[PDB]
Every structure is written in structure tokens, then in C-alpha cells.
Swiss-Prot record:
Spans annotated as Helical bundle R9: 7-174
Domain of life: Eukaryota
Entry's localization field: Cell projection, Ruffle membrane; Cytoplasm, Cytoskeleton; Cell surface; Cell junction, Focal adhesion
Name of protein: Talin-1
Length: 174
């Protein structure tokens, strides 16, 4: 949580990066454990509720992704607020995805949303990474301007992607 740049948000992004990085490892180990029956069935949720929890989070993530993109490039004092929101939704997503991983023995939908959550988490990680650089400061982030764009679009891509598996998982995993 250090500011090597010159703005608010640099802190929030790096602190969230630490948390988001942790969920990446959790998800990555989930896919490894679930593929070897080394994972326990969810944390504390049912099958259709997974579709509920994950989808509800993803939507609100995407909801904040756009305002965060705007914030990361300029809104320094606002960026931190977006980061707080983005990071918090990814936690249940991780939990829920790891849940679906070990719990869903229906179809590849299990591994699909497990991986997609991780993909979206990596998308958000790349997002928080670029947001930490550019946060409120377009100057020391000239090339970061480009990557911040790739990241924001990377999220919305994985957003639709995970959402597909989740929404179908109603009958595809239920």
C-alpha cells in the first residue's frame, strides 16, 4: 500500500491487489484440488444460490468497472472508492466459484465458471495493477493508458463469459 506516483488511489489499488492476488491463488488451487477430489463441497451455499451469488456480484462488478476505468485515469479521490467495491465482490466470487468447483458434478460448467471467475479475477488484477499506475495521473502512465483500456475491456469480456456459465448453471448445474 505505497504511493510511488502522486495521487490517492495508488494506496487503495495496491492494498486491493494484495487481496485480489490472494483470491487468484485460492481459485487456482481450487481448480487443482477439485480436479483431484481434494476440494470440499463449497463453503456455505446451495447450487442455485451459487448462480444467484456469483451473477449478482458480477453484474455489480461490471457496473463499477466502467466508473473505475474513468476514475483510474483521472478521478484519483474517486478511484479508491471504485477499488473498494471491485475487490469486495471478487471475494464471494472466489468462494462461490470454488464452491461450484467441488459441488457441481453436473457438467464442465463446474470447471468453466471456476476458471472464468479466475480469469475475471486476473482481469481485475490487471485492472487494479494498471489503475495503481495511472490512478489520477495520466502523465506517469502514458502507456498505462493503453493497458488500462485493455484491462477494463478484459473484465467486461469475462463478465459476460462467467455470467453465461452461471445463468445456464441454473439447469446446467442444478
Amino acid at each position: 500500500g505505497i504511493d510511488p506516483f502522486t495521487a490517492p488511489g495508488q494506496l487503495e489499488c495496491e492494498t486491493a491487489i494484495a487481496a485480489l492476488n490472494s483470491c487468484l491463488r485460492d481459485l487456482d488451487q481450487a481448480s487443482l484440488a477439485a480436479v483431484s477430489q481434494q476440494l470440499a463441497p463449497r463453503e456455505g451455499i446451495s447450487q442455485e444460490a451459487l448462480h444467484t451469488q456469483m451473477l449478482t456480484a458480477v453484474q455489480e462488478i461490471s457496473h463499477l468497472i466502467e466508473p473505475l476505468a474513468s476514475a483510474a485515469r483521472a478521478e484519483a479521490s474517486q478511484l479508491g472508492h471504485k477499488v473498494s467495491q471491485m475487490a469486495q465482490y471478487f471475494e464471494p466470487l472466489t468462494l462461490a466459484a470454488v464452491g461450484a468447483a467441488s459441488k457441481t458434478l453436473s457438467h464442465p460448467q463446474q470447471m468453466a465458471l471456476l476458471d472464468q471467475t479466475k480469469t475475471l479475477a486476473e482481469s481485475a488484477l490487471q485492472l487494479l495493477y494498471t489503475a495503481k499506475e495511472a490512478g489520477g495521473n495520466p502523465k506517469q502512465a502514458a502507456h498505462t493508458q493503453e493497458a488500462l483500456e485493455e484491462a477494463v475491456q478484459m473484465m467486461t469480456e469475462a463478465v459476460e463469459d462467467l455470467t453465461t456459465t452461471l445463468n445456464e448453471a441454473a439447469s446446467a448445474a442444478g
